[PDB]
RNA sequence: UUUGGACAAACUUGGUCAUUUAGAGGAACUAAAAGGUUUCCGUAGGUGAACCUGCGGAAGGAUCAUUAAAG
C-alpha cells in the first residue's frame, strides 16, 4: 500500500538519497563445471569490484540442472550445489559437493498400498571427504499378483536396509568423491541396489534421494586442475 | 418547450414567460414575491429520529474526545457582579 | 461462482480471484463446524448480491 | 447542518426484560428516597427510567444507541416528570457522571463487570446500587474467600464493598430469552473506605492470584513477579536482584501463609502479607 | 548469449514477492512486492499487484543483461499451507509475458518431515 | 574548478530556510550531507549553490531572523554553524560540534541576535539528550572552531526527538518527540518548565507562537493541539487532516495557523474559533518542509517528490478586484 | 483581517526519476532532461531560461535513453516499449 | 476487623507514589517575549 | 575583590494611550425561488463476560469426482 491513506510510520522521516547505482560497481564472473560433466559452461554471476572480489567468490553456492549439465532430460529431477573455491581471469572452479532430487519427483514417487524403505549412511571417501547418502525404494507388486498391496514384512525392511547401508558405503569407501559422481551420473549404484535385494523382495523406485557432504575436503582447488584439465600478462605500453 | 425555473440563481423566472432578476427588484417587490413563494409553499426513519432529537431542549452528546455538547454541534454550557450589575 | 474439487482433504477451487476467495469461507466455515443448512442460507444471500452486482 | 453532524457522531444503526414483578423489586432494593437522586444508564424503552421517575427527584439517562434514547424522550415529552429526566447519548465509562444517590440501570452485560469499579472508584459513590448481572459472573462477585467462583476480582470488590445477591432472573423474562442466566445484586460502598492504596492492594492482587490455587508463596518466586518486585524496591531505595528475592523469602516466612494456597486465605491474610512487602521496602504498585 | 537468472516467488496469503537474482542467488537482481504497486492494504496480495510487481521486475531483469530465469515458487509452508496462492500464479504468467525466457519451474516451499504447533489452537482457525 | 551547477532534482527536504543578507535565497536539509541553497525563484531557478562539510544524511536545519547564520543538524552525530561570507557571497563553516553520541534530529538557533552573532546553539539527538552549545565569537583567523563541550546536557525523552523550536525571547524552548509527549525546558538552565502529554500519535513538529503565549502541536493522530503556556493546557484541539500532521506554523500572528500533513493538504486554520477557512492542495506527496515569511504573507512548502508551492496572501488584492 | 487567499507557483524537478543521462546540444543552448517517461526540453539562455517543450508518452513507460542532435533540431527517445 | 485497622494504620508510614514504580501489567509480558511585536510597532 | 560615575537589559507597581476581544440587553438595515453461530465429555481459567478461552477425547455430524498404467 503507497495510498495517501495509509498512515504514516516512523521509518518514512529518514530516507538516504539514490545516489549510485550497485551495478555499475559490479563485475561479472563465469562459472565451470568439473570434467565429470559434459557442458562445463553453467552461467555466469556477479560481485562487487574488488577495492576483494575473491573472498566473496570463495564458499558461494550456486544449484543447477543435471539436465542442463548433461543436455539429457532423464536427469531432470537431480540438484548439484557449487561452492566456487578457485578463481581465475573470471572463471569458477569445483571437485565435487553434493547432490539432491526436485520435490515434485520425491512426492510422485511416494504412492499408496506400498511400503517405503529409506536408509541413511555417513561415510568418508578414499580422499577424506565425510558424506552422507540418502537412498529410497518402494515396493512392487509381481506381474501375476492379485493383491492390491505389496507391503513387506518389517524384517524384509530390516534386512533390504542392511543390503542397500552395505552397498552405500562400500562404494563411497572403495572409490574417490570424482569417481563417486561419476557412479551417480549412470545410476549404476541403483542398479546394483536392485539386484542385491532382489532375492529379499521385489523393489521399484530405488534411488539415492540425496547427498551431504558433513566434513570436507572442499568443493576444491586441489585436484582441480587436474580435474578441469599459469598465464603470462600483456605489457601496458 | 416550457417555461420553468430560473437557471441563475439570483434571478426568478415564473412560468408566465417574465424572468425577474434579483439585483433590479425594488425592496417592496422583493416582499411580495418572498411572500407569494409562502402561500405557494404552504398549501403545498433515522432523519425523524435526528430531528426528535433537535426539537427538545434537555439533549447532549458525547463525542470522542468525551466533551459535552448540544445536538446542533456546538458546546453546551451566575456571576454575583452581573445580576447585581 | 466458481468450480470446488474434493480430493479426499484436498480442496482445489477455480473461478476468479473474488469468487473462488468467497467459496473458500463457506467451504472453511464447514470444517470449523457449521451445518450445511445454515451455510447454506449465507449462499443465497451472497448470491443475491452477485446477481445485483 | 445539525443532522449531519448528528449522524457522523453516531450512525443510529438490545433485548429487554418484560416481567415487571422483577422490575418492582429492583426498585425496591434500591428504596431511593425523594431527597435523592439516581444516574440512569441504558434506559432503553424508558418502563425503568420512568418508575425512577416516580421515586426519584432527577433522572439523566445514557443511551447507547441514539435511537433508543430519542423514543424515550417521546414518552416522557409533555409530563409532569419531563422536567426531571435528562438524557445523554455515548457510553457513560467515557464522560464524567453527575453525582448521583444510587445507581438504578440496565447495564449492558459487556461492560457490567467494569461498570461496577467505576462505581468503586467514583468519589461520592451511591450508597446502594442496584444492577442485573449474569448469574455465572454475578456469583463470581458474591464468591467467598477459597470459592470456585472466587476470583481476584472478586477479591477487590468484597474488600472495597459488600455485596449480596437479589434474586436470579430467567431467560424466559428477557425477550427474546437468551441462552445466558440473568441475576439481581446489591452492592453497597464500605463507608468509610479503608485507606489502602488502590494500586499497591491491585499489585498484591495481580502477583498472589495469578493462580487462584498454586500456593501464595509460589506466586512470588515466579520470574517475571521478582522481576517487577525488583524495579520497583529500586525506585523505593531512590526514593542486586538475587538479594530482593531472598528478601521476598523472609516476608513470606514470617508471614507463614506462602505455602497455602491463595484462595483459602481471607483478605486480611494478604493484608498483613502486603505490609510485611512494605516493611521489606518491595512496594508493588 | 542466453544469462540465466533464478526468479523467486513467495506468494503470501497478505503479499506476494517476486526476487530475482543470479544463479547463486548470495546477490539480488531486482526485488518488488505487492506493496510497492498498489495504494491499499486489501489488494497487497491481490494478482494484480502480483503482476504488476512481475512487470517492474522483468523489466529491471532486462536492464541487468539477463535474459532468461529459473523460477523457484514458494509459499510461506511451516505449518501454514504449502501451495502457492494465486498471486504466485499470476506473477508467473506476467513473467511469461514479459519475454523472460523461462528454463525451469520447481515448487520449492518449506515442507517439514515433523512441525511445531499451529497459531490457530484446537478449535482451529480461518473462520 | 566548476564554472556552475545545475540541480535537476532535490531530493526529499526535511527542512527549509530563508536565508541570505536580504532573504533571497533558501537553504535545503536533504536527504544528502551536501546543504544545498538556491535563490528564491522571481514571482526555472537551475542553479543552487551546494556546500559540503557534513558526512551524512541532514536531519533538520535553523537560520537566523538576519540570514547571516546557519546551523546544520546532520546524521553522522555533528551540527556544523555556516556564516554568510559577503566577501565572497556565500556561507563557510563557523564551527563544529561532535559531542554527540547519535544523530543530531534538531538543531535550534538564537531567535534574537544582539551581539551581531548568534551565541548559543540548542541541538537533540536520537540519544535523547538536549545539549546547549555556546557559539564562539568571531575571529579572523577563518578557521574553523570545533567545540566539544556543551553548557548542560539533560536526557529529554524516551524516544526519537522530532522537533525543536525556541520561544522569541529565547527564554524556553519546547522540544517535540514520539513519545507522545512535548517537554518545555528553560533556556539558560535546561530545566523542565513543564511537560505536555494529551496527543496520541508522536509528535511531528513543535512551533512557538511568535508573539503571544501560545503552542501548537502536531501528532501522528491526524491532530493539531494548541497550548498555553500561562496554564500549560490545551486551549484549541484541530480536526480534519485526513492523515498526520507533521508541519504546524502561525501565521498572521495570533490569528491563524497553517499545518501541513501527509496527505499532502496544507490547511489555513483559525486559532481563536478553530474553522477551516482555506485549504491549499498543490502537491502529490508528503510534506516536511514548511516554512513562512513576513507572518506567513510568503508560504513555501516542498513535496517528497521535489516540487515547490510558491504562495502568496492576496486577500487584499482579491478585496480590491 | 485573516490570510486565507494564496496562489501556488510550482517548481517540478526537470530531471529525476530515469537512469537516462540527460543530452545537450552541442551550442550549450538546449537541454533535454528526461523525468519518468515525460521529457523537459529547456533552453539555457542565460537570464531566460524556459521549458521549451514538454514531451509526455502517456505509456507509462520509463525513457531508457535520450539524444539531442548537436544541431539541436531534432529530439530522439527510445521508451521501455 | 480490629486487627484489620491497625494493619492499615501501619502502612501509611510506609506509603509512596506509584508514577516511577513498574506497573504488575507487566506480569504477563515477561528582551520581552513581545519584543517581536514592539518590532512592528517600532 | 572594593569605592564612586554614566550606559543599561529584566522585574514589581499606579496611571495614561492603541488594539482586538467574552455573556446579557436595547434599537435599525439588508438577504432569504423552494417543492454472523454443530452437539458434547474431562480438566483448568476469565476484569469491554447478553458469554469467552487453553489442553486431550467423542459423533449421539450430510461421501461428490477419479481410481488395473509393471499397460
Known sequence: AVGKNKRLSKGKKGQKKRVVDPFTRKEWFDIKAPSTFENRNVGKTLVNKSTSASDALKGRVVEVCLADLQGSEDHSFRKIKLRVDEVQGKNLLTNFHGMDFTTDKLRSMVRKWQTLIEANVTVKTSDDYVLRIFAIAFTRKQANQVKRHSYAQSSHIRAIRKVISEILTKEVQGSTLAQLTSKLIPEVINKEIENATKDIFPLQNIHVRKVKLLKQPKFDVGALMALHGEEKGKKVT | ?85 | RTRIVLADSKIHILGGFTHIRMARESVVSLILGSPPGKVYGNLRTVASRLKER | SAEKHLSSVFKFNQHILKNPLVAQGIVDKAQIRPSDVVLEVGPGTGNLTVRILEQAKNVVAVEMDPRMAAELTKRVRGTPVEKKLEIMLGDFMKTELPYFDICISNTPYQISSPLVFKLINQPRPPRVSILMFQREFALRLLARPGDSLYCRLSANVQMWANVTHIMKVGKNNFRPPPQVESSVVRLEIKNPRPQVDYNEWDGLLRIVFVRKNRTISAGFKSTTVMDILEKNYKTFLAMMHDVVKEKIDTVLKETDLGDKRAGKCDQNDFLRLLYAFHQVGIHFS | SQVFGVARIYASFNDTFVHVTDLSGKETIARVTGGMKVKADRDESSPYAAMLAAQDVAAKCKEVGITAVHVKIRATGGTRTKTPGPGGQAALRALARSGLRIGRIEDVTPVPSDSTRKKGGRRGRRL | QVTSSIAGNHGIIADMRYVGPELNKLALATNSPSLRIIPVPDLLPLDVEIYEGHEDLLNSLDATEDGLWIATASKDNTAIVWRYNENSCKFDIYAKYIGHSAAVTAVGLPNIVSKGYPEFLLTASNDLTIKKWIIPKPTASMDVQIIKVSEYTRHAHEKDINALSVSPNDSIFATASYDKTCKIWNLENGELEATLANHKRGLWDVSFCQYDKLLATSSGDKTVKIWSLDTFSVMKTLEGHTNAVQRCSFINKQKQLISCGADGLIKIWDCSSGECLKTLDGHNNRLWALSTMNDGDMIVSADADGVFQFWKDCTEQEIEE | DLKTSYKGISLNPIYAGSSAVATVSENGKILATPVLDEINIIDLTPGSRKILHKISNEDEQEITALKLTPDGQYLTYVSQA | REERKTIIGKLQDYKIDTSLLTSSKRLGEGKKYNWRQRVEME
Open chain 2, 1 to 85: 418547450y416550457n417555461v420553468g425555473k430560473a437557471e441563475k440563481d439570483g434571478e426568478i423566472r415564473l412560468k408566465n414567460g417574465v424572468a425577474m432578476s434579483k439585483e433590479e427588484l425594488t425592496r417592496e417587490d422583493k416582499n411580495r414575491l418572498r411572500r407569494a413563494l409562502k402561500r405557494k409553499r404552504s398549501k403545498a426513519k433515522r432523519n425523524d429520529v435526528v430531528d426528535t432529537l433537535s426539537k427538545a431542549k434537555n439533549i447532549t452528546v458525547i463525542n470522542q474526545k468525551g466533551e459535552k455538547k448540544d445536538v446542533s454541534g456546538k458546546t453546551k454550557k451566575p456571576d454575583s457582579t452581573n445580576i447585581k450589575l
